[PDB]
Amino acid sequence: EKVFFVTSPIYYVNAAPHIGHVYSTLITDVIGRYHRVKGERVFALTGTDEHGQKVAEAAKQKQVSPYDFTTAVAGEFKKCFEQMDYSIDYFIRTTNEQHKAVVKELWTKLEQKGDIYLGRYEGWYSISDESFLTPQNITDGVDKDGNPCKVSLESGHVVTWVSEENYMFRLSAFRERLLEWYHANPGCIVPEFRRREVIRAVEKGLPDLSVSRARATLHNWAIPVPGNPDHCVYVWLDALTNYLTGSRLRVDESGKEVSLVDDFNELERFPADVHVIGKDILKFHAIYWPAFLLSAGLPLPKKIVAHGWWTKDRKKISKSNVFDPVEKAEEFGYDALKYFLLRESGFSDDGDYSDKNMIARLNGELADTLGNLVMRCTSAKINVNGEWPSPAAYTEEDESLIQLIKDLPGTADHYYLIPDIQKAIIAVFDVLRAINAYVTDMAPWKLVKTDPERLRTVLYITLEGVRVTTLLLSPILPRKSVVIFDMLGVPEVHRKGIENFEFGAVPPGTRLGPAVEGEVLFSKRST
């Protein structure tokens, strides 16, 4: 047993944060959260990637030193993510000294086992992606200022030629072993098809990788290569090591580091259980990262979730679709927008954000299915005693609904683990819709007069239903799930832990929380 260790990719500090990074870190957060709700110990980890030519030149463009610039931008990121009301255990920065120590340690480790040598790289490169590309991965396209240039087929950004004496990691040595790892662990890359892509790529062949760069090129704004000040460590070998650094930092109550353990075992975090990333950076996480680790005698991660790219109104996120997530959060609600991001598309798909679409999913899932159920379920009209009634005899119809509620956890457990947050959300909302049909059917408004003894069995099942679903929706709706429980008057101990996935863990005679006359759970908006 280990600390469950979930990651978010650390982001380039060249520009303000947006929905893309909020999205990636939310997925990180939800996986971390669910596992905590399971009662497991967890370490979630978002951060910023600060070194390298991309950011270095981003600082030059804004007429200011990288030190001042990166600190400032990295600050916008901590602010955004604080306001997004997450629950991550650390915000890492590659400018941090303890990190640098680890990168140098890893570098040395790799050198030691003869898998780094001094070579050349003569080929293409995208500064904007800090990615080496082969000629097949570039095409003709327009420079800014209209000039003919070469653009990346992956990114679309400008690619410049590079002819440098660089340090080379022996990636080609590791293709057969990588291929075993992909096959030995047929669920280590999700969604499935993105796995297949990785395997096709590795099936063809791997060249050795340039893991250092000419100091000059980077504007001296990267971690030096050990034993050779003339070089700096490739931004990605630096950036990828952030996962190993967070696994070795010890953190205090204010979220600041205090110490860097010598060994990764001391904190029982490494290797990552889930590396949430974007499809755009798969090759580094699924080919490079594991290759480095094997070289160095380290463990490999368990799972890499590579997701799709958001767009707004089908047009791509605006360099020049203004998208402030914190405002859309203030507009519609923070849990509401978290939900929408997680529900509106799965990891296989390139989601398309639309205000009107979210108004729909708010008004017709959160408000009208979930919210609606709760408002009836807890009411002086139906629940005249404001308690949890004792169940009478169970109808077969009762037993059907219950079986759905008994099963619902085990199913969502798989989907959360896959991970597929979408097929875990619907899974719950299938059970919420059922619970709702049942109640319309049983007509408890009528039963309060005809058959109070039967109304006990109806109200109780509903309540336990609404409870087990809300419990399993916690990581999606962290703040509203607490409001739901408060209305239900569930004890705090029954809001966490697998013991409370059991049907009927809250016993009858439990008193409902106070009834506020205005209290609406989710607010129906204009179309």
Ligand SMILES: CSCC[C@H](N)C(=O)OP(=O)(O)OC[C@H]1O[C@@H](n2cnc3c(N)ncnc32)[C@H](O)[C@@H]1O
């Ligand atoms: C070892 S980690 C080093 C990573 C490196 N520092 C880096 O890649 O920096 P970066 O800010 O350009 O990263 C872009 C990342 O943000 C998300 N993302 C961005 N745009 C998105 C969108 N439109 N939709 C969904 N997700 C998006 C997505 O996760 C993608 O990988």
